Amino acid sequence: MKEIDELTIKEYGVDSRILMERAGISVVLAMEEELGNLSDYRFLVLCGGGNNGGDGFVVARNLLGVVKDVLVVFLGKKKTPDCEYNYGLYKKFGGKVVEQFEPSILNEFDVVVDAIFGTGLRGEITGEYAEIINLVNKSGKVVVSVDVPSGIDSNTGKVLRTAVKADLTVTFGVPKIGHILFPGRDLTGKLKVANIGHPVHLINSINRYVITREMVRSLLPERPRDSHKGTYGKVLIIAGSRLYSGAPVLSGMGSLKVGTGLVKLAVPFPQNLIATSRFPELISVPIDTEKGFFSLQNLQECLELSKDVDVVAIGPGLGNNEHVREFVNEFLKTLEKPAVIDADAINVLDTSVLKERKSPAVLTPHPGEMARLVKKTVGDVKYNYELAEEFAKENDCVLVLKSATTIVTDGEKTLFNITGNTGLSKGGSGDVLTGMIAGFIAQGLSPLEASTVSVYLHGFAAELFEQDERGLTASELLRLIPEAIRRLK
Amino acid sequence: MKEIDELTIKEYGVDSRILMERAGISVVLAMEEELGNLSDYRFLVLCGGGNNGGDGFVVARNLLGVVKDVLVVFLGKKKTPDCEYNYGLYKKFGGKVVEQFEPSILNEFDVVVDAIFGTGLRGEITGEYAEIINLVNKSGKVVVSVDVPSGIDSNTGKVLRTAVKADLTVTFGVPKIGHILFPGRDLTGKLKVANIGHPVHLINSINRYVITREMVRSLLPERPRDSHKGTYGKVLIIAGSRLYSGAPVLSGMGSLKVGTGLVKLAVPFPQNLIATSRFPELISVPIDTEKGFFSLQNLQECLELSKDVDVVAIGPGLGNNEHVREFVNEFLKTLEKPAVIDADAINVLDTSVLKERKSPAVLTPHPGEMARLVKKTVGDVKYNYELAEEFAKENDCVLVLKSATTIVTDGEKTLFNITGNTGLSKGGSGDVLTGMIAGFIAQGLSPLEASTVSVYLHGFAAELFEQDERGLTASELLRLIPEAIRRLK
Amino acid sequence: AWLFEA
Amino acid sequence: AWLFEA
Ligand SMILES: CC(C)(COP(=O)(O)OP(=O)(O)OC[C@H]1O[C@@H](n2cnc3c(N)ncnc32)[C@H](O)[C@@H]1OP(=O)(O)O)[C@@H](O)C(=O)NCCC(=O)NCCS
Ligand SMILES: CC(C)(COP(=O)(O)OP(=O)(O)OC[C@H]1O[C@@H](n2cnc3c(N)ncnc32)[C@H](O)[C@@H]1OP(=O)(O)O)[C@@H](O)C(=O)NCCC(=O)NCCS
Ligand SMILES: CC(C)(COP(=O)(O)OP(=O)(O)OC[C@H]1O[C@@H](n2cnc3c(N)ncnc32)[C@H](O)[C@@H]1OP(=O)(O)O)[C@@H](O)C(=O)NCCC(=O)NCCS
Ligand SMILES: CC(C)(COP(=O)(O)OP(=O)(O)OC[C@H]1O[C@@H](n2cnc3c(N)ncnc32)[C@H](O)[C@@H]1OP(=O)(O)O)[C@@H](O)C(=O)NCCC(=O)NCCS
Ligand SMILES: [K+]
Ligand SMILES: [K+]
């Protein structure tokens, strides 16, 4: 968007002052939408010397004569030209500016407008900026942040030593990565994205996206009336072990609940019988194993089972030992079908295999699994969308990096999912999503499309749970999938 | 407001381009508020070469990429600098402009945005501008006018040969006289007044006002609990004749229904008995007249009746003959109380008397009565607020010039009333308003305040009638006054 | 009412 | 939605 503002001024010829005026009035309107009538409130506007501060002076000026009181505290040592222009207007209109933040000043105001730093912040916040931000956060006032809460790195969502906790953030043109990834997402509060007059073509030239309800609705496959089960695809799920007998069942029902026609599971005997006792609509093939885990002796049978399906999911509950590792890698190297690779299949995966496959794959790691896959620390991979993009491009796959905000990428397009809640931070949730992705691929969506629709619907289903989210289990999530689909439509 | 825009740019330093951008975005938001989601509509924007047209280019540009279709027809031979600037932006953003209005083009659009002429129009519209405006008015499309419907004289509300009939008019800063007086008021449709960033001090330096609910609520007098009838004033109404026996009754009840403490009527016997048969709370004093009309022989009695009141109303139903003329003028010259002068008292009034009175007066003519009073034609006085102001200043009075839009002025402040409906175009309505004004003066409001509150409440009462307005009568209006007061509070 | 008087 | 995506 730094690019976007510059082209809009330099190539399109929109005066920088017009963009700044539109930015500020949009904050005023946003506030009115959340607070109702503004005339009873007293506003403290905290302005930096940059263009975020300039936007703050526009806000402040537009409140003059209309609200109970407005004061600007200017916290800068110099002003960008647009900030200087809007400072001068604020003062010409009769506005009061002070240059020293006295901690008790907070007592006399209802709303704090945070226009200290925007996307221009670089480096840790120190000194008196930090003391001020901390005082605002302890004040209990309503906080409205201009563009991004001050102290959030707009490219990453990390806190730069400290940051404002906003009730309402008003950003311009498009959301920033820092609104979408945590901790930034938490500090943003309610986000409104304001149209401030950039050409719609430039706004739409962005290559990273938030997954929206309208996007998912347009990707949901068609259900032709004259269909039969094969119309809706066939999935094989290779999953489970004597240790982990539940995973197959959750993956399988995840495929069925999204509309897949036929789902079969290959599960070590007698753990395969667990699935049909719970959901007799599943096909749960018994696999004769030596000690309760898949091994190379099961390679040929699993390849034969794969011949008559559209997609294969592998990994949930397989276990991780050397014999599973041999099986997984040899299977994936030979399988000429799309694969969804999760859990223990990721843990044992040789990435060389991904490079040599002709068929597509989707990988669904959490950050612990991603860290192991690229031999890095969890902190180095968590919310690292550039790493994810590089990995997907280098390995010719779709990568679905699960977290509260889920990143989906094929290395060219990257999508961020914000549906869900903490009830999904519980064993079994990932197994459901794996089945969902395979099911949608089986119905004819591309690996990327299937991943996009699935992460959104999985999170939206969680949110439809009727009692406290901490009590949500994967079994209940399964029941909520068709409701999420209905509500989406 | 020509003044207002210039000071805002030249003294306050707001770039003219910023004001024009704010004007245009305000039209977009106004449209969304009335049409809902704009994305399904096709917009035809008609732009002149002036700043109204410039505002139109801002509207058009802001719709690009967001609605079904936008086309501008540019109808000018040259462009003001701001219009030229916004034309260039419109084109840079990919907007289509044609310079010839083909009559069938209307078929392909849902909404016409009228940005041809604003407050800059001078003189009759001829030629192809007129043909275009007439085609828009025959088209049945939704019409949104920028600032004022093109063809209305913004200072007077007259049609300059022809004018656009708008469904929605969006004006900037303040309403214009042309929105408020007819025929302009009719052609405006629904009016929204947008804040486009003028300093609130300049907006409030205007000396003419629309009478609003908030103004009337703040002027309504207090009702202290420990009161008695005298707290709320005493009114004498000198009214009626053998020809016109109903007028006194309507005036008297008009005073009582607005909260006046005591109302007495002086009416020629036996017509005085009509009043108490209908409303026995009135005092209706019998006056012994020679032939059924007040004359000089009743002067002394009426002066004695005036000693114990706060205000005297005179005129409704008196009749107009030489003996009434002698009485009225001698009475008013001698009466040292505020007077409300209506109807036949206006018809016989010698304005020299107004100049020589020490006490205040309010006059309540309709345009026929005003025309007779200043010896002009009805067309010369109707909606002539400058004449009204001159008359009030020269005669030291408040003038209430009744019409669908009522003008109230003391020569320094002028207020326009827009409440009411056509049920008030019926005999008896004016007699009620006279009593209302006297009553409010008796309660302690200034002549100007009393006139302001009364015209608003009188019109608002009419609008509360539950059946078709053409069936409203003065008797029913009386019943609705206390409801208007309640609703106002 | 910040933007419009109606 | 002309002004805001929420
Ligand atoms: C203009 C833009 C290209 C980036 O620069 P910017 O907007 O001026 O940047 P900000 O207002 O966020 O902040 C800049 C100021 O932050 C402060 N700053 C940055 N890091 C800091 C640090 N860690 N410690 C203290 N101060 C710091 C400084 O005051 C800095 O200027 P300085 O380093 O010369 O002193 C653009 O991305 C932007 O933020 N504008 C967004 C769009 C907008 O606001 N709409 C229209 C108006 S142009
Ligand atoms: C399943 C079992 C292996 C536990 O493993 P697990 O918690 O699922 O471990 P995972 O590979 O899935 O990785 C979890 C890690 O990923 C990372 N992680 C996952 N999601 C994350 C996210 N959103 N953000 C940050 N970190 C995340 C964390 O480091 C997490 O560690 P933590 O749980 O300590 O915080 C174990 O309980 C079991 O079922 N069998 C026991 C068998 C055994 O080993 N011993 C007996 C022999 S039979
Ligand atoms: C600028 C202002 C001082 C008055 O001038 P203006 O706005 O340019 O005037 P308009 O757009 O209404 O119209 C001017 C044009 O109307 C047309 N015109 C006027 N009378 C005409 C006639 N009867 N026949 C044909 N054309 C006529 C002309 O095209 C004229 O320019 P021209 O005579 O040189 O050809 C101001 O009062 C105004 O209309 N702006 C309102 C505020 C606003 O729009 N907000 C901010 C933007 S500045
Ligand atoms: C009352 C009586 C005099 C009729 O008069 P009226 O209609 O009330 O006349 P007004 O002085 O009030 O003036 C009305 C004129 O004012 C003007 N007028 C009033 N309000 C107006 C407005 N809002 N806009 C424009 N014009 C307006 C019009 O010219 C109107 O004329 P119109 O009714 O022909 O359109 C008559 O019917 C009567 O009651 N008595 C008859 C006695 C008589 O003269 N002859 C018999 C002898 S006893
Ligand atoms: K900020
Ligand atoms: K217009």
Q: What are B157-161's contacts with CB under 8 Å, separation 24+?
A: B157/B181, B157/B182, B157/B183, B157/B184, B157/B185, B157/B383, B158/B183, B158/B184, B159/B183, B159/B184, B159/B187, B160/B121, B160/B123, B160/B124, B160/B125, B161/B124, B161/B125, B161/B126, B161/B130
Instruction: Pick the closest to residue B236 from B327, B339, B137 (CA basis).
Output: B339
Joined together, the tokens standing for residue B303 give 């002066």
B64 vs A64, A65, A200: nearest CB: A200
List the beta bridge partners of residue A45.
A72, A113
Contacts of B379 (CB under 8 A, 6+ apart): none
Determine which of B4, B7, B21, B86 to mutate to test the interface with A (most A C-beta atoms within 10 Å). Answer: B21
- Asked if A199 and A8 count as a contact pair (C-beta separation under 8 A), the reply is yes
| DSSP helix/strand/coil, A258 | coil
Contacts of A37 (CB under 8 A, 6+ apart): C1
Can you say how many angstroms the Cα of residue B117 is from the centroid of all Cα atoms in its chain?
24
What ranges in A204-342 are assigned the alpha helix state H?
Answer: 213-219, 247-257, 273-278, 299-306, 322-334
Say which amino acid occupies B453.
Answer: V
Q: How far is Cα A242 from Cα A239, in angstroms, rounded to an integer?
A: 11
* A379 in a labelled binding site: no
Side by side, which strands form the sheet with B339-341?
A: B208-210, B414-417, B406-409, B398-401, B361-363, B339-341, B311-314, B234-238, B262-268, B283-287
* Ramachandran category for residue B197: left, alpha or beta (phi over 0 → left; psi -120 to 50 → alpha): left
Joined together, the tokens standing for residue A335 give 């399988």
Q: Does ligand 4 come within 6 angstroms of the Cβ of B319?
A: no
| Ligand number nearest to the C-alpha of A136 | 5
Q: Work out the widest C-alpha separation in chain A, in whole angstroms.
A: 85
A149: phi then psi, degrees, rounded to nearest 5: -55, 130
* A404 in a labelled binding site: yes
* A150 in a labelled binding site: yes
Query: In angstroms, what is the resolution?
Result: 2.0
Residue B225 carries which DSSP code?
S
Helix (H) or strand (E) holding A284: strand A283-287
Q: How far is Cα B427 from Cα B469, in angstroms, rounded to an integer?
A: 14
* d(CA B431, ligand 4 centre) in Å: 14
CB burial of B126-159 (b: ≥16 within 10 Å; e: otherwise) equals: eeebbebbeebbeeebbbbbbbbbbbbbbebbbb
Domains A1-206 and A207-489 share a fold: no
Chain A: touching chains (3 or more CB pairs < 8 Å) = B, C, D
Q: Work out the widest C-alpha separation in chain C, in whole angstroms.
A: 11
Residue whose pair of structure tokens reads 């410039």 in the numeric block: B54
Joined together, the tokens standing for residue B116 give 């041809």
Q: Does ligand 4 come within 6 angstroms of the Cβ of B378?
A: yes
CB burial of A268-291 (b: ≥16 within 10 Å; e: otherwise) equals: beebbebbeeebeebbbbebebee
A170: phi then psi, degrees, rounded to nearest 5: -115, 115
Helix (H) or strand (E) holding B283: strand B283-287
**Counting Cβ atoms within 10 Å, is residue B60 exposed (0-12), middle (13-18) or buried (19+)?**
buried
* Domain A1-206: CATH class, spelled out: alpha beta
Q: How far is Cα A443 from Cα A261, in angstroms, rounded to an integer?
A: 8
- How many Cβ atoms are within 10 Å of A218's Cβ, its own excluded? 9
Q: How far apart are the first and last CA of chain A?
A: 32
- Asked if A95 and A29 count as a contact pair (C-beta separation under 8 A), the reply is no
CA neighbours closer than 13 Å in the CB half-sphere of residue A116:
28
For a substitution probing ligand 2, which of A291, A378, A401, A434 has the most ligand atoms within 8 Å of its CB? A378
| Ligand number nearest to the C-alpha of A370 | 2
- Among protein residues, the one whose CA lies closest to atom 29 of ligand 4: B368
Residue whose pair of structure tokens reads 């036949």 in the numeric block: B344
- Among protein residues, the one whose CA lies closest to atom 45 of ligand 3: B20
* d(CA A17, ligand 5 centre) in Å: 18
* d(CA A120, ligand 1 centre) in Å: 3
- Asked if A47 and A53 count as a contact pair (C-beta separation under 8 A), the reply is yes
In this complex, do D6 and A192 lie within 8 Å of one another by their Cβ atoms? yes
Q: How far is Cα B182 from Cα B160, in angstroms, rounded to an integer?
A: 13
Say which amino acid occupies A122.
Answer: R
Residue whose pair of structure tokens reads 């000194």 in the numeric block: A127
Q: How far is Cα A59 from Cα A45, in angstroms, rounded to an integer?
A: 8
- How many Cβ atoms are within 10 Å of A355's Cβ, its own excluded? 11
For a substitution probing ligand 3, which of B55, B117, B177 has the most ligand atoms within 8 Å of its CB? B117
- How many Cβ atoms are within 10 Å of A212's Cβ, its own excluded? 15
List the beta bridge partners of residue D5.
A193
| DSSP helix/strand/coil, B236 | strand
Q: Which atom of ligand 4 is nearest to the CA of B343?
A: 12
Joined together, the tokens standing for residue A318 give 């397989």
In this complex, do B192 and C2 lie within 8 Å of one another by their Cβ atoms? no
List the beta bridge partners of residue B138.
none
Chains A and C form CB pairs within 8 A to the count of 9
- Cis peptide preceding B360, ω within 30 of 0: no
Locate the domains of chain A by residue range.
1-206, 207-489
Residue B105 carries which DSSP code?
G
Method of determination used here: X-ray
Q: How far is Cα A168 from Cα A20, in angstroms, rounded to an integer?
A: 19
Q: How far is Cα A88 from Cα A83, in angstroms, rounded to an integer?
A: 9
| Ligand number nearest to the C-alpha of A77 | 1
Q: How far is Cα A474 from Cα B197, in angstroms, rounded to an integer?
A: 55
CA dihedral B240, B245, B249, B251 (to 10 degrees): -40
Q: How far is Cα B348 from Cα A120, in angstroms, rounded to an integer?
A: 78
Residue B221 carries which DSSP code?
P
Contacts of B166 (CB under 8 A, 6+ apart): B114, B143, B144, B145, B149, B187, B188, B189
Q: How far apart are the first and last CA of chain B?
A: 32
- How many Cβ atoms are within 10 Å of A479's Cβ, its own excluded? 13
Instruction: Pick the closest to residue A444 from A209, A234, A228, A217 (CA basis).
Output: A234
In CATH terms, the fold of domain B207-489 is UDP-N-acetylmuramoyl-L-alanine:D-glutamate ligase (3.40.1190)
